[PDB]
Nucleic acid binder design. Sequence first.
DNA 1: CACCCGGTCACGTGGCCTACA
DNA 2: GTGTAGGCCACGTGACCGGGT
Lengths: 65, 65
Amino acid sequence: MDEKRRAQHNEVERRRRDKINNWIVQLSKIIPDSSMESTKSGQSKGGILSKASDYIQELRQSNHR
Amino acid sequence: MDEKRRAQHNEVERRRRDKINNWIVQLSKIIPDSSMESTKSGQSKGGILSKASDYIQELRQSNHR
DNA sequence: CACCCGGTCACGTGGCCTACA
DNA sequence: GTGTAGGCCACGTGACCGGGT
C-alpha cells in the first residue's frame, strides 16, 4: 500500500500563513479603515493596510516607550 | 492574441508583494525592540504582529477599557 | 563534517469580484 | 449587456536558515 512519508508537504506550510491570518483580522476590524462598499461587505485588509498602520504610528509616537 | 495581459501582472503583482514585506517592516518596527538578527539579507514578519497585538490591546484599550 | 529536518520568506500563479468605459 | 484592466485572496515552489542526533 504505497503511502510514501514525503510529508514535508500540504500540512506543513499553510499551518504558517494560516497563523498570520488570525493576527491581521485584529487590526482590520479594530482599525477603522477605508474598505469601500458594494454587495455585503466581504473584501479584504489589503484595502485596510492602507489605513491600518496610521493609528499605530500616531499611538506609539505620542505615548508608548 | 491573448498576449501579456497577465504577464505584466507578473511584475505588477510583486508590486503589492513588496507592499506586503516593506509595509511590513517599516510599520512593523516602531513597536518593541526586537532583533531577529539579520545579515546581507535577513528574515522578518510574524511576531511583530503577535506582540503588536498586546500593545494594540493596551493603547486600543486607549480610552480606558 | 554528516547529512534528515523543521522552521519561515518570498516570488510567480490562478481565480473571483467590480467597475468603466 | 460586453469585453478592458484591475482589486484582492488562496495555493504552491525553493531559498536558507537554524540544529540535531
